[PDB]
Design a protein around this nucleic acid. Sequence first.
DNA 1: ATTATGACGCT
DNA 2: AGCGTCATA
Length: 430
Amino acid sequence: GPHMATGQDRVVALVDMDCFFVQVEQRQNPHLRNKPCAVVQYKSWKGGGIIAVSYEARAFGVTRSMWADDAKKLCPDLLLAQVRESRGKANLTKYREASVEVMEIMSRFAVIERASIDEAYVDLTSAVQERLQKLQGQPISADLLPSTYIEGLPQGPTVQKEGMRKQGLFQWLDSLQIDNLTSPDLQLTVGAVIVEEMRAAIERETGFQCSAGISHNKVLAKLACGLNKPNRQTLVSHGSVPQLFSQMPIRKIRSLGGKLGASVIEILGIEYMGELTQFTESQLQSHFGEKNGSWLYAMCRGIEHDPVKPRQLPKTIGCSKNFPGKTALATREQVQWWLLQLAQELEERLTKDRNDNDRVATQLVVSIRVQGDKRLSSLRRCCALTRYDAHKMSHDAFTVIKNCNTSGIQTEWSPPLTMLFLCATKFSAS
DNA sequence: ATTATGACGCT
DNA sequence: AGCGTCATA
Ligand SMILES: [Ca+2]
Ligand SMILES: [Mg+2]
Ligand SMILES: [Mg+2]
């Protein structure tokens, strides 16, 4: 009743760049614009592995993780851009720098949490309040929401996509009560107005297009963002949740796409998020633990409290290379040479990070994989990171891992190494 | 032979 | 600490 929290206290958005690495390459090379194209890494093995795909190329069935040679079978005219290679390995600097461009623009509008290289959560609660004041009970025009979808509308008693969008928008705005500054639906709507403006700014100042979700929390905002891509934004109201969740596979909700989601489905014998409402909080805790159970109980009702953390910079700076199949490292000279290549890229990124961001990493984490192990990482060891020097870091990395060498011969390395990873962590102000 | 990352949870 | 899970291009 009057004491039941509805999780409508905040306005939260999730902004996600459309086919990000592709857009970075298309800005640089106009010949790639408005074409089926993809970004690939390496080239020798099956034409390279695809890591990003334009919407034009997706229409042919091209996807992430596909070999370019196979993608070319679906899309003969597919254009490719290759990730830069430095020191024998893929180098993602261009994309990291493009990400910074976008994150800095978003930060002008509100506090953001960097969620990945191409997405950020935005806490719009305060900005919405401000804007509501300037508004002075004034109605919100559809013209202010030119790329917004209202999930679940239109409904009730045109055959084009943009027509449906506008019909839904009209029904929503027609129902809106603007004299109530505390109406959660109004708050979301003003949130959407602001996100339109943020998205226009990103495009104007970078050339990049993105999509966005606007709701009352991070999980719903993230889900909303994916509902209408590319180049559009979607508002998911509290009221829209029961219908939305009634047919939403559990695995679509962030954090349930893996083993836990699978167990929820298996143990409870359900398929859709909405079916969770029929269990008690204690029942859910009994199966999935205290934390996950409480989270599930609230989430299936559209409620979640994870804050947008004020963090625009990554917490770690890492460098990784796989050495698949026959390329696995089997000699000490090999292992040392590659530890050095990695350490050299790490040093470059760390030094730049110190100058830009006034901080210094203090821990070096070294991880390897050995041939045969099914896990992504076989062994993780840490040592002190006291100086930004590539020769030192690589020597230290070798020191922490050298005991892994089963070989009776000092010069040989067995079992061969299929992955090396150096990560700088535990930053302190400087 | 997806790869190269990056955040957070468990014990 | 070191391992595991889930997620990004
Ligand atoms: Ca994206
Ligand atoms: Mg993304
Ligand atoms: Mg993606």
